[PDB]
Write a protein that binds this ligand. Sequence first.
Ligand code: HEC
Length: 123
Amino acid sequence: EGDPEAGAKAFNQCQTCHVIVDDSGTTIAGRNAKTGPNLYGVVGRTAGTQADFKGYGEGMKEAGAKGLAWDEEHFVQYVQDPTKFLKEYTGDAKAKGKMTFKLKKEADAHNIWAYLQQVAVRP
Ligand code: HEC
């Protein structure tokens, strides 16, 4: 279990590419980055299915087609090394992630998740 407060601060790194904008258009976190998908509603979301994002890689779509819904266990392994995670999960030797960024600290991964659990759950 992470700490939502430390998570919100560490989310600053993710803001270079991601935003968290709700369904009414309110910006919860971030500026205007569109390199990565909107993370609002990511908790429990089938991987690679945010309807507005058109930049998903084959590995990510394939992972969601094989039953990956984001929960803490997979999220933590994923942000630490996206490509390695995609290959393991899919069993596809050619899978590779578009997210070139890698989170270097494990404690941060849990913190950011606690923060997402707070502000990114769609009812
Ligand atoms: C730009 C260089 C990025 C940074 C910095 C971070 N992310 Fe990212 N993310 C980016 C892309 C281009 C993608 C698509 C990946 C693909 O292979 O298709 C993603 C995706 C995610 C996901 C998947 C969500 C989904 O809709 O299925 C997650 C959960 C995610 N990113 C989280 C995340 C976090 C928490 C970051 C900060 C530590 C982070 N990303 C940074 C691009 C970039």
